[PDB]
């Protein structure tokens, strides 16, 4: 058009329509006087060869041809139809799955309780009980409250108002209401009081956590009884009371000063349990008024990160299928040495930022609070005392009469009751008050909630007079096991940055502060009954990015139903036993097509059917996976590979797993899998890297690798050393110079020209430095401190008289000088030793098969050298690790090439050539 080019909507850029001398001038003055923003530059979209003009759907929905179901799986068959002059990117495809989910009775997406949270945890509800008479003869005792002040009390109840001349009485079904009482702080004469009380027939439960559903629209909870005529009727019964002194009188003066509305209710404790059960005897009693409640542990339950586990991968028995209708041959070739899920995890990390959540794919990385993993104990800022005061601001007082002086005398005084009251309330001295250390309490609560309750089960004990399951994998067991707060109190490693030794080997991601798991639990909702509707992506490396040319194709895949696989819980309890169930109602397949111009689509199809233009992909992980059993408490882990070809071997990577948290894939269903926590093998939530000591690599036999006198200790890879006489540790921890150098080179190629912090983009979530956490602390020297004394938790007393004894129960004992912990600071500091260690979560240990350990090219220089390229070699690796009281696994990834070439010669045909070297099929 004419005016567009003039107004620079269209036309040429500023560099082209301006004076050449001015453009030259602008380039010269750019650095100190830019003129770019002064002149418009047009941007024009192409008008032809891009988009079609005929009617064309952007999204196709395919309902499955055939669906089969077992108890633990279900396979769906789709006929993916790519029409002519249409082009489909498999990245734009996903399965739309809908069903009903039941997370079960162990799902608790919150801490604390929903009911009477502010109530003191030992305070009972207004209750009654039968008790031995003793002056069988029994009598009923009442313990209650009467907050409502009424007009009068007759046999018709408490008078709550008047309707002209008629007195109005409380509707027993909901009046008086328990949340109503006096509106002023100071005392008043209440000659006609009323309240509600629970009958002796209703079990005794502490107020904290008490819930009784309502039986009427006005909030009444009185259980209704079905009468003969078939109508429901209230069983609320009135109980009148007067003072014992008043009942001593003859009787004519006898009148009730209190009326309690006694009722039965369906009490329950949905989200709390009993922390102190005084007696095993069942039935209401005065003793049972002392039982204390405690909120049930939080247990978030959701679908896994990136919907890990929903789709079968790397399972020969349940292999996905993509094929052309014509050719019966399948394009998918899956192996059990492949790890598709973990590959997708690390791939996603390499591409983008895993800290960001994307609801569609359940893309929310598993994580843990850093201040929970490593405790950084600064103590508390409690310099100022904190006080609570009387609601009146004064407290108890005495009554005083005013007096006035005899103004003509030295010290004469006279009563003055004419103008002033003789009962004036005055308190002499400071007001009444109580004291609390708020920050100390908050710190203590944090430690007990996030750390103490997660200690290994060997440090807990079974509650007294409370039934508990026999299965340690159940929520009931994890919830009722008692941990004493003194194990993780305010004074733990005070002033150190130090993770508890007992917690190092505990999966930090099985925690209620796992932000990712929590987000994925709340994406479903806050209830256990959840109708869900989700989108599941294709992760197999050969397909997920394939560009499918016209033709029809069978796309068939298998899916899991195992709650322990498809669901994830923060506590890891066995969701099979704990009542979780899932049902997949329907499934569809959605494919998004570029509305490509038909001439362009045909030309591109033609170009892509040629041999030279076969599409090629490879697994990001690019490794063959091997798991070697490490029996309990074993430190030496020997493994050997028979003589074979190593051409293109890229290197080793390894970490350590727990057999409990690692399911046996390929079987289709693991009957011995009793765990619903994170699965590091799949999601990359590794956390046992610190338990490695050293690795010995021996090619063939007697040939050490890398040898050549390279390392400070050349025969073996020394990861960490306990007290190095040589002084080969680094970075103020127990890691070796050799190992640190190797890892820095493997991850960033830094070692040889100085050590520094890698660039952020190079140091990602699963990188080494990002997760490298060295730590040190001091501890009493039991040999050199002459006054040492071993005082277990049973006889430690710090904050005695203000905390519970060995339980999260109530205040107990007396004030007394502490006997624990030993002071490591100040004039009286004890002789101390120093312990160094480190943590390295999420990352993998890397030994690249490179001459200088660097990354100069995927195909390592050693992967090409003559020795390993034109000969066969057997391998013998020996890992020395820290002992652990349960079976573990050595996870070794043999870094190789895992490539696939994909050829589409004709419409509806698809051929694939798979190669993985070293370690071929």
């Amino acid at each position, epitope marked *: 058009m004419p005016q567009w080019s003039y107004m620079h909507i269209s036309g040429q850029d500023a560099s082209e329509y301006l004076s050449p001398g001015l453009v030259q001038f602008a380039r010269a003055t750019e650095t100190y006087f830019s003129l770019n923003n002064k002149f418009r530059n047009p941007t024009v979209a192409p008008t032809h060869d891009v988009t079609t003009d005929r009617s064309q759907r952007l999204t196709l929905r395919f309902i499955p041809v055939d669906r089969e179901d077992t108890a633990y799986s279900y396979k769906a068959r789709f006929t993916l139809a790519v029409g002519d002059n249409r082009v489909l990117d498999m990245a734009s495809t996903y399965f739309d799955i809908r069903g009903v989910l039941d997370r079960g009775p162990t799902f608790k997406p919150y801490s604390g309780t929903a009911y009477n949270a502010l109530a003191p945890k030992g305070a009972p509800n207004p209750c009654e009980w039968d008790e031995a008479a003793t002056a069988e003869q029994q009598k009923t005792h009442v313990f209650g409250q009467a907050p409502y002040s009424g007009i009068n009390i007759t046999k018709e109840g408490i008078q709550i108002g008047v309707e002209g001349q008629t007195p109005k009485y409380a509707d027993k079904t909901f009046q008086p209401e328990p949340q109503i009482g006096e509106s002023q702080w100071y005392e008043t004469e209440i000659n006609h009081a009323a309240g509600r009380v629970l009958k002796k027939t209703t079990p005794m439960k502490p107020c904290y956590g008490s819930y009784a559903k309502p039986t009427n629209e006005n909030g009444g909870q009185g259980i209704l009884v079905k009468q003969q005529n078939g109508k429901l009727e209230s069983q609320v019964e009135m109980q009148f009371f007067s003072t014992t002194e008043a009942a001593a009188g003859n009787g004519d003066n006898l009148t009730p000063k209190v009326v309690l509305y006694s009722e039965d209710v369906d009490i329950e404790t949905p989200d709390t349990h009993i922390s102190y059960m005084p007696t095993i005897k069942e039935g209401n009693s005065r003793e049972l008024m002392g039982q204390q409640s405690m909120p049930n542990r939080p247990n978030y339950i959701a679908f896994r990160d990136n919907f890990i586990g929903l789709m079968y991968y790397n399972s020969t028995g349940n292999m996905g299928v993509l094929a052309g209708q014509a050719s019966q041959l399948n394009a998918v070739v899956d192996l059990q040495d492949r790890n598709t899920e973990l590959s997708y995890q690390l791939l996603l990390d390499s591409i983008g930022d895993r800290t960001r959540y994307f609801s569609m794919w359940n893309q929310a990385v598993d994580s843990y609070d850093p201040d929970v993993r490593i405790i950084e104990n600064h103590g508390t800022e409690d310099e100022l005392p904190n006080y609570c005061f009387p609601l009146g601001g004064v407290g108890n007082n005495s009554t005083y009469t005013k007096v006035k002086p*005899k*103004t*003509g005398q*030295e010290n004469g005084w006279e009563k003055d009751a004419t103008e002033f009251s003789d009962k004036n309330e005055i308190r002499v001295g400071n007001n009444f008050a109580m004291e609390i250390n708020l920050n100390a309490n908050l710190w203590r609560n944090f430690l007990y909630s996030n750390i103490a309750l997660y200690l290994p089960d060997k440090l807990k004990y079974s509650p007294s007079n409370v039934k508990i399951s026999d299965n340690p994998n159940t929520y009931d067991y994890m919830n009722k096991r008692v941990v004493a707060p003194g194990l993780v109190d305010c004074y733990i490693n005070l002033g150190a940055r130090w993770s508890l030794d007992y917690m190092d080997n505990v999966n930090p991601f099985n925690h209620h502060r796992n932000a990712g798991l929590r987000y994925r639990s709340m994406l479903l909702g806050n209830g256990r009954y959840v109708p869900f509707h989700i989108q599941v992506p294709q992760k197999f490396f050969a397909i997920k990015n394939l560009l499918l040319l016209p033709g029809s194709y069978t796309y068939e895949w298998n899916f899991r139903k195992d709650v322990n696989m498809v669901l994830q819980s923060s506590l890891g309890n066995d969701l099979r036993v704990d009542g979780a169930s899932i049902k997949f109602d329907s499934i569809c397949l959605y494919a998004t097509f570029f509305p490509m111009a038909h001439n362009t689509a045909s030309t591109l199809e033609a170009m892509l059917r040629n041999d030279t233009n076969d599409q090629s992909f490879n697994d990001y992980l690019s490794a063959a996976n091997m798991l070697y059993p490490i029996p309990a408490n074993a430190t030496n882990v020997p493994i050997s590979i028979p003589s074979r070809n190593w051409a293109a071997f890229r290197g080793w990577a390894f970490t350590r797993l727990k057999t409990k948290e690692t399911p046996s894939l390929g079987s289709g269903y693991d009957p011995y899998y009793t765990y619903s926590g994170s699965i590091p093998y799949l999601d990359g939530t590794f956390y046992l890297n610190h338990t490695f000591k050293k690795v010995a690599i021996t090619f063939d036999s007697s040939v050490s690798w890398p040898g050549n006198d390279r390392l400070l200790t050349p025969n073996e890879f020394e990861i960490k050393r306990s007290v190095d006489g040589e002084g080969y540790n680094v970075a103020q921890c127990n890691m070796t110079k050799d190992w640190f150098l190797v890892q820095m080179l493997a991850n960033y190629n830094i070692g040889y020209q100085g050590f520094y912090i890698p660039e952020s983009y190079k140091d990602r979530m699963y990188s080494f430095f990002r997760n490298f956490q060295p730590m040190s602390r001091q501890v009493v020297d039991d040999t050199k401190y002459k006054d040492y004394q071993q005082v277990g938790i049973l006889h430690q007393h710090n904050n005695s008289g203000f905390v519970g004894y060995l339980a999260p129960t109530m205040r107990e004992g007396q004030a007394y000088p502490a006997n624990f912990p030993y002071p490591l600071i100040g004039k009286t500091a004890v002789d101390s030793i120093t312990q160094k260690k480190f943590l390295c979560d999420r990352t993998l240990w890397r030994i690249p098969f490179s001459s200088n350990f660097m990354s100069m090219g995927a195909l390592t220089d050693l992967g090409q050298n003559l020795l390993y390229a034109n000969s066969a070699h057997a391998l013998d690796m020996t890992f020395e690790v820290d002992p652990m009281d349960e079976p573990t696994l050595l996870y070794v990834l043999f870094e190789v090439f895992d490539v696939v070439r994909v050829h589409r010669p004709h419409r509806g045909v698809i051929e694939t050539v798979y190669l993985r070297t070293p370690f071929s099929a």
Partner: single-chain antibody, 227 residues
């Protein structure tokens, strides 16, 4: 907050040794039981006889007795004796200003120490400053009052300086009186201004007890004023 007038009846009396004498006092308002009777002879200073209506001060013969409460009080001598011929005064310290009665005249029919400065005299319109040296007690424990007796008149309470230094003056003097004290020198000063010929009087330094009225007096200082 309004002067309490002690009305003493009769005015004068004639008596013989052995007779019984009775004097009465009517206050403008109740003083509970804060009535006291004093005996004064021309030369000497007042002597406390009865206080709190019915209580006999220390070293007072048995023949003296007091009675009454509120507004009415009575002082009776059961049997007169030549040493008792003097002029007796009603008194109240329930309220400030302290007030005495007009004083009755008994005529015939046929340790703690306060020392004042010397007497003096001056012309109208001028001022005086009188001293009162104290011994036997601390001025931080007691306040010192100033009273005066004008010829042919009763007893006039002038003011007081209390233990804490707080002064209280008789409004009748229109702020002419100013009382000060030096604790170091243990002396009390009373300064009167704008003298008039009617201020010709004896001026007495005085001190009360912890729980009984004025009981310790100075020697008296005669101030004369004439044109």
């Amino acid at each position: 907050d309004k002067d309490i007038v002690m009305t003493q009846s009769p005015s004068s009396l004639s008596a013989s040794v052995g007779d019984r004498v009775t004097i009465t006092c009517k206050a403008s308002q109740s003083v509970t039981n804060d009535a006291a009777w004093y005996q004064k002879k021309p030369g000497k200073a007042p002597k406390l006889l009865i206080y709190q209506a019915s209580t006999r001060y220390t070293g007072v013969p048995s023949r003296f007795s007091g009675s009454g409460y509120g507004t009415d009080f009575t002082l009776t001598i059961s049997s007169l004796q030549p040493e008792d011929f003097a002029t007796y005064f009603c008194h109240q310290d329930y309220s400030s200003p302290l007030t005495f009665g007009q004083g009755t005249k008994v005529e015939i029919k046929r340790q703690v120490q306060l020392v004042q400065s010397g007497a003096e005299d001056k012309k109208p319109g001028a001022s005086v400053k009188v001293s009162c040296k104290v011994s036997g007690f601390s001025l931080g424990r007691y306040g010192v009052h100033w009273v005066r007796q004008a010829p042919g008149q009763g007893l006039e309470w002038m003011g007081v300086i209390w233990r804490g230094g707080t002064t209280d003056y008789n409004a009748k003097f229109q702020g002419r009186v100013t009382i000060t004290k030096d604790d170091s020198k243990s002396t009390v000063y009373m300064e009167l201004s704008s003298l008039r010929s009617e201020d010709t009087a004896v001026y007495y330094c005085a001190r009360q007890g912890s729980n009984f009225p004025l009981a310790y007096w100075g020697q008296g200082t005669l101030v004369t004023v004439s044109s």
